[PDB]
Design an enzyme around this catalytic site. Structure first.
Site, mmCIF file in Angstrom:
data_model
loop_
_atom_site.group_PDB
_atom_site.id
_atom_site.type_symbol
_atom_site.label_atom_id
_atom_site.label_comp_id
_atom_site.label_asym_id
_atom_site.label_seq_id
_atom_site.Cartn_x
_atom_site.Cartn_y
_atom_site.Cartn_z
ATOM 1 N N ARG A 36 38.633 53.677 45.455
ATOM 2 C CA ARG A 36 39.619 53.338 46.474
ATOM 3 C C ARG A 36 40.907 54.098 46.198
ATOM 4 O O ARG A 36 41.474 53.991 45.105
ATOM 5 C CB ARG A 36 39.882 51.830 46.513
ATOM 6 C CG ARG A 36 41.141 51.452 47.284
ATOM 7 C CD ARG A 36 41.918 50.337 46.594
ATOM 8 N NE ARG A 36 42.905 50.861 45.654
ATOM 9 C CZ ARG A 36 44.162 51.154 45.974
ATOM 10 N NH1 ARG A 36 44.592 50.974 47.215
ATOM 11 N NH2 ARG A 36 44.990 51.631 45.054
ATOM 12 N N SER A 130 37.886 46.815 50.959
ATOM 13 C CA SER A 130 37.880 45.361 50.814
ATOM 14 C C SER A 130 39.053 44.717 51.552
ATOM 15 O O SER A 130 39.212 44.899 52.758
ATOM 16 C CB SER A 130 37.895 44.970 49.331
ATOM 17 O OG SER A 130 37.678 43.581 49.157
ATOM 18 N N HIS A 131 39.873 43.969 50.822
ATOM 19 C CA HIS A 131 40.982 43.236 51.426
ATOM 20 C C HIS A 131 42.234 44.097 51.591
ATOM 21 O O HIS A 131 43.263 43.621 52.071
ATOM 22 C CB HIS A 131 41.314 42.001 50.588
ATOM 23 C CG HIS A 131 41.733 42.320 49.187
ATOM 24 N ND1 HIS A 131 40.831 42.630 48.192
ATOM 25 C CD2 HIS A 131 42.960 42.384 48.616
ATOM 26 C CE1 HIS A 131 41.482 42.869 47.068
ATOM 27 N NE2 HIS A 131 42.775 42.726 47.297
ATOM 28 N N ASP A 301 37.734 38.543 54.670
ATOM 29 C CA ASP A 301 38.464 39.738 54.282
ATOM 30 C C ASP A 301 37.914 40.951 55.040
ATOM 31 O O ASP A 301 37.211 40.805 56.046
ATOM 32 C CB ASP A 301 38.409 39.906 52.756
ATOM 33 C CG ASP A 301 37.045 40.327 52.256
ATOM 34 O OD1 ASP A 301 36.024 39.887 52.828
ATOM 35 O OD2 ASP A 301 37.000 41.101 51.280
ATOM 36 N N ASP A 303 35.713 43.551 54.294
ATOM 37 C CA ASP A 303 34.293 43.873 54.261
ATOM 38 C C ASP A 303 33.396 42.642 54.278
ATOM 39 O O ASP A 303 32.169 42.788 54.290
ATOM 40 C CB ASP A 303 33.972 44.737 53.037
ATOM 41 C CG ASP A 303 34.374 44.081 51.737
ATOM 42 O OD1 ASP A 303 35.284 43.229 51.759
ATOM 43 O OD2 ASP A 303 33.780 44.420 50.692
ATOM 44 N N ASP A 305 32.973 39.834 52.163
ATOM 45 C CA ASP A 305 32.410 39.177 50.992
ATOM 46 C C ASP A 305 33.315 38.085 50.436
ATOM 47 O O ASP A 305 33.009 37.518 49.382
ATOM 48 C CB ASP A 305 32.094 40.206 49.902
ATOM 49 C CG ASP A 305 33.282 41.080 49.553
ATOM 50 O OD1 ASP A 305 34.355 40.903 50.164
ATOM 51 O OD2 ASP A 305 33.140 41.948 48.664
ATOM 52 N N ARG A 306 34.415 37.776 51.118
ATOM 53 C CA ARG A 306 35.323 36.721 50.694
ATOM 54 C C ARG A 306 35.538 35.735 51.832
ATOM 55 O O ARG A 306 35.366 36.063 53.009
ATOM 56 C CB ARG A 306 36.672 37.282 50.228
ATOM 57 C CG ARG A 306 36.578 38.238 49.053
ATOM 58 C CD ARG A 306 37.866 39.023 48.889
ATOM 59 N NE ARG A 306 38.159 39.306 47.487
ATOM 60 C CZ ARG A 306 39.367 39.207 46.942
ATOM 61 N NH1 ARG A 306 40.398 38.829 47.682
ATOM 62 N NH2 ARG A 306 39.545 39.486 45.659
ATOM 63 N N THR A 370 35.732 38.735 34.984
ATOM 64 C CA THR A 370 35.942 39.133 36.368
ATOM 65 C C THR A 370 35.077 40.344 36.710
ATOM 66 O O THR A 370 35.064 41.338 35.980
ATOM 67 C CB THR A 370 37.425 39.446 36.589
ATOM 68 O OG1 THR A 370 38.156 38.222 36.757
ATOM 69 C CG2 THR A 370 37.628 40.340 37.798
ATOM 70 N N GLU A 389 33.917 32.926 42.464
ATOM 71 C CA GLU A 389 35.103 33.434 41.796
ATOM 72 C C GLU A 389 36.349 32.920 42.502
ATOM 73 O O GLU A 389 36.376 32.814 43.735
ATOM 74 C CB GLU A 389 35.118 34.964 41.775
ATOM 75 C CG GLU A 389 34.286 35.581 40.671
ATOM 76 C CD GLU A 389 34.304 37.091 40.718
ATOM 77 O OE1 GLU A 389 33.906 37.658 41.759
ATOM 78 O OE2 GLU A 389 34.729 37.715 39.722
ATOM 79 N N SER A 391 38.880 34.382 43.201
ATOM 80 C CA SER A 391 39.376 35.380 44.139
ATOM 81 C C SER A 391 38.725 35.207 45.507
ATOM 82 O O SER A 391 38.426 36.192 46.192
ATOM 83 C CB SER A 391 39.127 36.786 43.592
ATOM 84 O OG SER A 391 37.773 36.940 43.206
ATOM 85 N N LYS A 402 28.613 39.294 47.277
ATOM 86 C CA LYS A 402 29.125 38.029 47.776
ATOM 87 C C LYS A 402 29.175 38.064 49.302
ATOM 88 O O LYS A 402 29.142 39.129 49.926
ATOM 89 C CB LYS A 402 30.500 37.725 47.178
ATOM 90 C CG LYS A 402 30.496 37.693 45.651
ATOM 91 C CD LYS A 402 31.488 36.686 45.085
ATOM 92 C CE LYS A 402 31.310 36.521 43.579
ATOM 93 N NZ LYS A 402 29.935 36.070 43.215
HETATM 94 O O1 LIG Z 1 41.981 40.734 39.276
HETATM 95 P P1 LIG Z 1 41.214 41.990 39.626
HETATM 96 O O2 LIG Z 1 41.017 42.816 38.372
HETATM 97 O O3 LIG Z 1 42.006 42.792 40.627
HETATM 98 O O4 LIG Z 1 39.750 41.577 40.288
HETATM 99 C C1 LIG Z 1 39.732 40.638 41.345
HETATM 100 C C2 LIG Z 1 38.443 40.757 42.124
HETATM 101 O O5 LIG Z 1 38.180 42.165 42.432
HETATM 102 C C3 LIG Z 1 36.898 42.327 43.178
HETATM 103 O O6 LIG Z 1 37.014 41.730 44.399
HETATM 104 C C4 LIG Z 1 35.710 41.708 42.444
HETATM 105 O O7 LIG Z 1 34.575 41.717 43.344
HETATM 106 C C5 LIG Z 1 35.956 40.328 41.979
HETATM 107 O O8 LIG Z 1 34.921 40.003 40.997
HETATM 108 C C6 LIG Z 1 37.287 40.146 41.321
HETATM 109 O O9 LIG Z 1 37.533 38.746 41.109
HETATM 110 ZN ZN LIG Z 2 35.924 42.193 49.953
#
Ligand SMILES: O=P(O)(O)OC[C@H]1O[C@H](O)[C@H](O)[C@@H](O)[C@@H]1O
Ligand SMILES: [Zn+2]
Length: 566
Positions: A36, A130-131, A301, A303, A305-306, A370, A389, A391, A402
């Site tokens: 990214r 992602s987000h 979010d 994509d 998965d959240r 994580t 998670e 997150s 997810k």
């Molecule tokens: O706190 P970070 O290092 O930014 O990671 C936060 C999140 O990033 C991604 O979304 C992963 O799929 C998650 O497993 C994780 O919880």
């Molecule tokens: Zn995502």
């Protein structure tokens, strides 16, 4: 017109495959969520995209690459369509047999995992950040998933980085023009080749919707959501990729009114907002929930998965609790009836709410760092059924990513089975298992060396035996460490996964870094039914003050309040 395109293809003749020289970049190291960067990295820098894509192709063996099928799709953010066209031409020149692409490039990450597993593809390319926000001034990313539907492991991404650091040439079919808007098969005559190249534009929702139809009871969902006495729901796709899924599944197939969806048209900039589901970036949703009509809310979010789960009048079910309620009512879902509970798992910074459900039954619970790698490792070993998670992540072993809409439909199945409100279900859960008061402070984008120095000095302050046993106000330090995880399937060792302060009453204060970004997690357990119904911000305030004081976060970062509170 399809006929005009066919005649054009016939008159142009075979399309040459050509080798072009390039110069390698040096920051194309794909991390946990792929590679990214800012959008201008992929849109403006010469051959950046071609370099990374060609590196992905080279990371696949030649016998695995010749004639194989590859899924391609993304979250619909800006520049996704152009990059997808480049991927189509390069894949045509790199011996790929067939590309299954979602209509107009639309394909949610769970849908990519599902399609990969279904069509027996060699893998997939997901165009998502992602987000992270999109647009010409936003972000852009590329994820590579392998034949099991999940993210590429560290060896594959390592080979992609090493290949990308020295790449000098790539192949492309520059005259191949593909229409992403029309469903069906498009074939292309390639020069000096006997088999044609196939591009199958499929419906973005069909296969995924069939999977969910196999997972849940769509009759109960239909009766719950479509009736005149319907359960009023408001789903906020945040102008993301789950919009089409929300309509074709929740609205059309299951009969929820069209007013139930909002921000459900995928926008290339996500409508200017961050496609991140939380109390800050999805405040509009929670404030319409504050009104009165709806009993259930949810946000996704970029994509897909959240997920964020909300109750009536804005009642917030934090993800650590969401996964625990899903685990406590896991047999309200037919999928786990067929499957059985193979195991529970959560990331270390996630609260131990799921642990209480795992200990109530006799199901193994794995506290991973994580990331997805550990969850997928457990899933492929038939040792993980449901994982979550903090997150805003929730998922099962049905795929290798997810799945937000899956979690939403699971919550709707639990609501349909229990015939209670979200807040009532959460209250009953708290009274049965005790409440894990949980919070997370996100201090986004601080100075790097200040945060790293804070983590080093704080770490050394923790490791001293002058720290263990000291009483803070009251709490007592039991253990302090830097979280380490030994993987129970491949023997991998992950160190420096978060600074942990475990107290004698079971409470935890965790510090982590995501540049950079400081993340502070606080988790305190309460078993007395008289104390499980207080403001968590007020219950956790002593531990928050202990965290800020012990860390000296304010005096080293200059920040006086977290950017986001969860
Ligand atoms: O706190 P970070 O290092 O930014 O990671 C936060 C999140 O990033 C991604 O979304 C992963 O799929 C998650 O497993 C994780 O919880
Ligand atoms: Zn995502």
């Amino acid at each position: 017109e399809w006929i005009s395109g066919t005649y054009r293809k016939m008159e142009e003749g075979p399309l040459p495959l050509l080798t072009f020289a390039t110069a390698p970049y040096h920051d194309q190291k794909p991390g946990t969520s792929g590679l990214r960067k800012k959008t201008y990295y992929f849109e403006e820098k010469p051959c950046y995209l071609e370099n990374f894509i060609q590196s992905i192709f080279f990371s696949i063996d030649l016998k695995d690459r010749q004639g194989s099928s590859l899924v391609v799709g993304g979250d619909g953010r800006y520049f996704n369509k152009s990059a997808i066209e480049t991927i189509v031409q390069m894949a045509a020149a790199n011996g790929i047999g067939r590309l299954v692409i979602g209509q107009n490039g639309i394909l949610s990450t769970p849908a990519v995992s599902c399609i990969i597993r279904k069509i027996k593809a060699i893998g997939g390319i997901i165009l998502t950040a992602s987000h992270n926000p999109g647009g010409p001034n936003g972000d852009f990313g590329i994820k590579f998933n392998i034949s099991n539907g999940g993210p590429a492991p560290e060896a594959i991404t390592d080979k992609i980085f090493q290949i990308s650091k020295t790449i000098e040439e790539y192949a492309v079919c520059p005259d191949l023009k593909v229409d992403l808007g029309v469903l069906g098969k498009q074939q292309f005559d390639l020069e000096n080749k006997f088999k044609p190249f196939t591009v199958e534009i499929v419906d973005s929702v069909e296969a995924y919707a069939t999977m969910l139809r196999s997972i849940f009871d769509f009759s109960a969902l239909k009766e719950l959501l479509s009736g005149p006495n319907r359960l009023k729901i408001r789903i906020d796709a945040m102008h993301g990729v789950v919009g089409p899924y929300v309509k074709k599944i929740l609205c059309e197939e299951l009969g929820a009114p069209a007013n139930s969806a909002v921000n459900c048209v995928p926008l290339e900039d996500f409508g200017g907002h961050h496609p991140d589901p939380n109390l800050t970036y999805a405040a509009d949703l929670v404030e319409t929930m504050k009104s009165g009509e709806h009993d259930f809310g949810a946000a996704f979010d970029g994509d897909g998965d959240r997920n964020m789960i909300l109750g009536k009048h804005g009642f917030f079910v934090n993800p650590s609790d969401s996964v625990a309620v899903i685990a406590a009512n896991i047999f309200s879902i037919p999928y786990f009836q067929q499957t059985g509970v193979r195991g529970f798992a959560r990331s270390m910074p996630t609260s131990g709410a799921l642990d209480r459900v795992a200990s109530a039954t006799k199901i193994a619970l794995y506290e991973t760092p994580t990331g997805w790698k550990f969850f997928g490792n457990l899933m492929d070993a038939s040792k993980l059924s449901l994982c979550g998670e903090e997150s805003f992540g929730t998922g099962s072993d049905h795929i290798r990513e997810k799945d937000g809409l899956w979690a939403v439909l699971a919550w709707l199945s639990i609501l349909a089975t229990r015939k209670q409100s979200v807040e009532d279900i959460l209250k009953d859960h708290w009274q049965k298992y005790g409440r894990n008061f949980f919070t997370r402070y996100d201090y986004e984008e601080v100075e790097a060396e200040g945060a790293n120095k804070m983590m080093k000095d704080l770490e050394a302050l923790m490791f001293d035996r002058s720290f263990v046993g000291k009483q803070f106000s009251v709490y007592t330090v039991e253990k302090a460490d830097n979280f380490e995880y030994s993987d129970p399937v491949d023997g991998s060792i992950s160190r420096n996964q978060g600074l942990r302060l475990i107290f004698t009453d079971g409470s935890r204060i965790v510090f982590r870094l995501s540049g950079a970004t400081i993340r502070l997690y606080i988790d305190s357990y309460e078993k007395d039914v008289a104390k499980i119904n207080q403001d968590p911000q007020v219950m956790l305030a002593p531990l928050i003050s202990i965290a800020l004081k012990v860390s000296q976060l304010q005096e080293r970062t200059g920040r006086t309040a977290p950017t986001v509170i969860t």
